[PDB]
Structure formats: C-alpha cells, structure tokens
Design a protein. Structure first.
Length: 537
C-alpha cells in the first residue's frame, strides 16, 4: 500500500505553514493540520494584553526578508500580537497555503506502519490519513495546579486563552473598580501587569520567584526607518544567518573578567538603555560560561531595579538571588518595575506564603485572604519539555515516543529519532528553539528538511531513520556543549541522567544550546555526504 500524501505537517504557526508551502512548491502533496480556526500559532492563540515580540520585528520577519511578502510594513520596532497575526495572515495569503490545511482539527495519534513505510495519522480520533513523512511543527512551547480555581465567583482570565471580541481584540481589559489578582511573573505576567495596573482599583501580584527582566525600549517605526530596513534586507538576512542565535546581535569579543569595573559599568549602562536584547546578546563572551562575568551583569541589572523601584523591600523581592542572568529566555518589559511604585499595586510573596486555594471570594494564601473580583492566570510555558506529549506517537514495534525519550530526547541532528522513521521534529528545545530567533531558525530548518525529502524523492528512497551510532554521537555532543555552560548548574532538571542496568552513565539535555551556524554547518556536511548517519532505503 502507498500513502495518499508525501507529507503531513502538524501546526499552522510560522514554522508549519512555511514547511507546507515549501513541500507544495516542490511538486509534492502535503496536508497541514491545525487545531485552531486559522493560521498564526503563537500569534493566533495568545491574545492577552501586552502580548508582543522580544525580537526586532524586521529580524523575526523571515517571510519579508526572504521576499515572500517583501512589501510588508512594520508599525513598531517590537510588533504587538495583533500586528504579528496580520503579518502571518498576509504571509499565508502570499504562499496560498490555507488550501493545504485542515483547520479546527487535532492530530490525536500517529502510528508508523512498518510493512508500508508510512504514517497513519489520526484526526480527532476518527479520520485516518496516510503520508510518507510526518513533520511536527507543534510549537517550541507547551502548557495551573491550584485547588479551587473552579470555585471563584468573579471573572477568571487565562493568558493562554484570553477571551476576544468578534474583531479578535481581547475582552474585559478595563479593570476600573475591580480588585484584580495576577498569578505569575514570567514573560506573560510582566507584559500583563503594567497594563492591568492602569485601570485596576487594586492589583495583587502573586509571585513565587522573580525572573530577570530588561527594558524592551519599544517605539514606533517611521516610514523612513522601514524603507531603509527593507533596502538592507539582503544584508540583514546574511547577518542573522550568521549569528549564534539568529537575533541581530553577536557577543563582545572580550571576557568580562578582563574589563575594569568602570569600563564594565559604562558598557552595561549603554546596552541597558539600547532597545532590545543587546544587554544580553551583545554582552561579554564569557557571560554564560563564567560565574564572575555573569555576576557582574546580574549585579548591574539588580542595581537598575533598585533605581527604578522606590521601596527597597519591594525592590529586593523583584531581584533573583538564586539564578544567573540569562539562564532563562529573559523577559523584556515596558515600565514593569515602575508598576510597583503605584499605590494600588501589591506584591504577594507566595514562596513564603504559598497559595492554599482559590475560593469563591478570591485567593487564600498561607498567611492571608485576598478578596478579588478578577483573577488572571499568567501561566508560564515549558520551553524545555516540548509539545508532542499530547499526541499518541507510535514507531517501530509499537514503541511510544514518550517512552523512547523517557531518559531524555535522543535524536540525530535534532530532527529524527531512532525508532521513528520518516518523522521530523521541527522547532523544539531539543533542536535550539529556546534561545533562537525562531522566525529565522525555524525557516532555515524547514528548508533543510525540504532538501532531504526532495533528495529522497529524486532517488526513490521511501525510508529514513538514524543509526544508533549517529544518534548516540549527536546526543552526547549536544550534552557536552550544554554541560560547559552555566545552564547546567542552574537548570539541573534540564538534564536527564540514567545509570544503565550494568553501570555506565547516560546524560542527555532537554535543551540544545549550540550555535545556529555551527549546527547548520554540521547538517550540511551530513546532507552533502548522502545523509551519512541516516539509513536510507
Ligand atoms: C508571548 C510569546 C512571545 C514570543 N516572542 C518571540 C520572539 O519575540 N522571538 C522568537 O524567536 N520567538 C518568540 N516566541 C516563541 C514562538 O514560539 C515562536 O516565535 C513561533 O511562534 C513558533 O512558531 P511554530 O510554528 O514553530 O509553533 P507555534 O507558533 O506554537 O504553532 C504550533 C501550532 O501547532 C498546533 N498544534 C499543536 N499540536 C497540534 C495537534 N496535535 N493537532 C493539530 N494542531 C496542533 C497549535 O495549535 C499551533 O497553532 C514567543 C512566544 C510567545 C508565547
């Protein structure tokens, strides 16, 4: 039996729609599947107030850099979610990609059929479609275990499904007269909190531990700036393809320990005040390698927080004590810290007073009862464990992907796993999503996968799977790269350590941290050498 499709692509975010576009442009048959009503992924799902890029719009805008929608005009240096959604909609118009997709459809299971070298893909546990290759673009992030949520009698908002009007704007964003509680001070919370505080009668921020945040420095984009950027796109593209993260930044050549205190302070002050991520990405070369260097920057950011927040007790609570700066994807913010100088804003330390439950009346901590009218659940993400866990994926000998990866992801090139032929995982933490400009990283990744599938078609190969040796060597190489950074000591659970039935010890990181260009170079050496390390038939 032969599959009906060359490929199924799961997800209609930026990654998935471009993979689908590429496959179709190449003359192959592709079906996209998407749970939502339309395209956008992130930019479709996340509708909460303050939702905005951390990457310069022009640098994230790969579909414009690549000449798919080159006329696109950005209105701001760091585009808001509604603009991002318009960009993805326009890109999808230009790629004519919607016709290849099933919308409002969840892939519930995928099983590899060994006799027939194809995937049976189950849609909403009913229809089954067959394809030669299965490609996940289910998103680099996934996603509250609090007693009593269902009992609250006021309004509940969840940042991941913020209610919208018929025009797609967020409902109930005016909190005039309302006592509001926000739980969470990750990326979403720090975008939500300063906006909610503008109208709430009282705002309580329930925070377990603070993250490092830096100011975004967003501003409108002039027509003149937009035109000069567009004229520079061929250069901008070459640049972002050459940096380690694919953001438009590269590390300072110097070690922080080599620079005087006075020079360090001046350098940091300039970068802190420059819009975007430079404070981190343009920082000293040893910032994520060396504790002293890291501490220089963390101390500087801490000093900036103390400047910006009036009450020294409150300030201290907002400054991380227990983790290096940049050990997580750093939230950027617009007047977040100054929000706490407002008289109607209160920080509730729930490490010291954990939440016992949500009640009909509001929130109960170990120490106090907060009567609220509104609760906003500003829930975090896992940028670490990946988005495939909700799909029943079965490879050879009916093995679960979740079991195969129990001791940590095991892949070759971060793209296929032994046991799961003709299955490609785009854009996930195990291949670099966590610290990438995903607009660019993911687009380049989809192009490599296109080239592999085309090669297979040209040669009449219908089977691909990593060897055990190549998968093992890769996975050890990725771990060793990870193990030389401060991430390893700071995020201990990002590493899975397993002593084998005999005595030897296996270590795998959940998160690939290797430089983009080095990673892509290794992928091309493999592709050039007839996909050496993949068995093909
Ligand atoms: C608030 C926020 C701000 C961000 N800002 C930036 C930024 O500035 N720069 C940056 O590089 N990254 C940023 N990110 C990361 C973001 O994940 C990527 O930029 C990008 O949107 C990921 O695109 P994707 O297509 O790979 O996955 P997604 O955009 O997550 O799309 C995945 C799609 O797959 C669908 N799906 C999942 N499972 C199934 C299933 N089983 N069946 C059918 N459909 C399924 C989902 O519905 C979704 O539509 C941000 C993320 C968030 C949440």
């Amino acid at each position: 039996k032969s599959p009906a499709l060359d490929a199924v692509v799961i997800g209609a975010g930026v990654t998935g729609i471009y993979q689908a576009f590429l496959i179709n442009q190449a003359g192959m048959k592709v079906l996209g599947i998407e749970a939502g009503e339309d395209v956008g992924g992130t930019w479709y799902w996340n509708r909460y107030p303050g939702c905005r890029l951390d990457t310069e719009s022009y640098a994230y805008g790969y579909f414009a850099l690549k000449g798919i929608i080159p006329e696109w005009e950005w209105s701001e240096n760091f585009a808001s979610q509604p603009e991002m959604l318009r960009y993805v909609n326009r890109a999808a118009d230009a790629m004519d990609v919607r016709k290849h997709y099933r919308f409002n459809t969840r892939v519930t299971a995928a099983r590899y059929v060994e006799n027939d070298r194809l995937w049976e893909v189950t849609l909403d546990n009913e229809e089954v479609v067959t394809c030669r290759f299965l490609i996940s673009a289910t998103g680099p992030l996934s996603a509250p275990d609090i007693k009593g949520i269902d009992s609250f009698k006021g309004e509940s908002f969840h940042s991941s499904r913020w209610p919208t009007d018929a025009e797609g704007a967020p409902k109930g964003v005016d909190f005039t007269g309302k006592r509001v509680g926000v739980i969470g001070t990750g990326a979403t919370g720090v975008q939500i909190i300063p906006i909610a505080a503008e109208t709430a009668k009282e705002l309580y921020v329930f925070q377990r531990t603070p993250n490092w945040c830096t100011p975004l420095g967003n501003s409108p984009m002039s027509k003149e700036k937009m035109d000069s950027l567009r004229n520079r796109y061929p250069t901008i593209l070459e640049y972002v393809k050459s940096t380690d993260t694919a953001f438009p930044y590269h590390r300072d050549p110097r070690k922080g320990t080599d620079v005087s205190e006075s020079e360090r302070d001046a350098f940091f002050e300039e970068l802190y005040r420059q819009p975007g991520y430079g404070i981190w990405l343009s920082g000293f070369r040893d910032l994520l390698l060396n504790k002293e260097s890291n501490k220089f920057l963390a101390d500087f950011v801490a000093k900036k927080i103390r400047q910006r927040v009036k009450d020294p007790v409150v300030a201290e609570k907002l400054i991380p004590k227990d983790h290096p700066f940049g050990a997580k994807r750093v939230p950027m913010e617009t007047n977040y810290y100054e929000t706490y100088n407002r008289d109607n804003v209160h920080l509730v330390d729930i490490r010291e007073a954990p939440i016992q439950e949500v009640t009909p009346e509001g929130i109960k901590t170990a120490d106090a009862a907060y009567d609220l009218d509104v609760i906003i659940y500003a829930t975090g993400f896992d940028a670490v464990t990946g988005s495939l866990d909700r799909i029943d994926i079965r490879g050879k000998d009916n093995v679960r992907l979740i079991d195969a990866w129990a001791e940590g992801p095991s892949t070759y090139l971060g793209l296929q796993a032994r046991g799961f032929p003709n299955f490609f995982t785009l854009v996930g933490p195990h291949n670099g999503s966590t610290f990438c400009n995903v607009g660019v990283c993911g687009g380049l990744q989809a192009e490599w996968v296109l080239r592999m599938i085309s090669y297979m078609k040209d040669n009449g190969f219908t089977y691909s799977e990593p060897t055990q040796a190549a998968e093992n060597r890769w996975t050890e190489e990725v771990y060793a790269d990870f193990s030389r950074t401060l991430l390893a000591e700071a995020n201990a659970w990002w590493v899975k350590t397993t002593t084998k039935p005999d005595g030897s010890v296996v270590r795998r990181t959940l998160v690939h941290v290797s430089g983009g260009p080095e990673y892509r170079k290794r992928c091309e050496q493999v592709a050039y050498n007839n996909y050496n390390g993949f068995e093909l038939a």
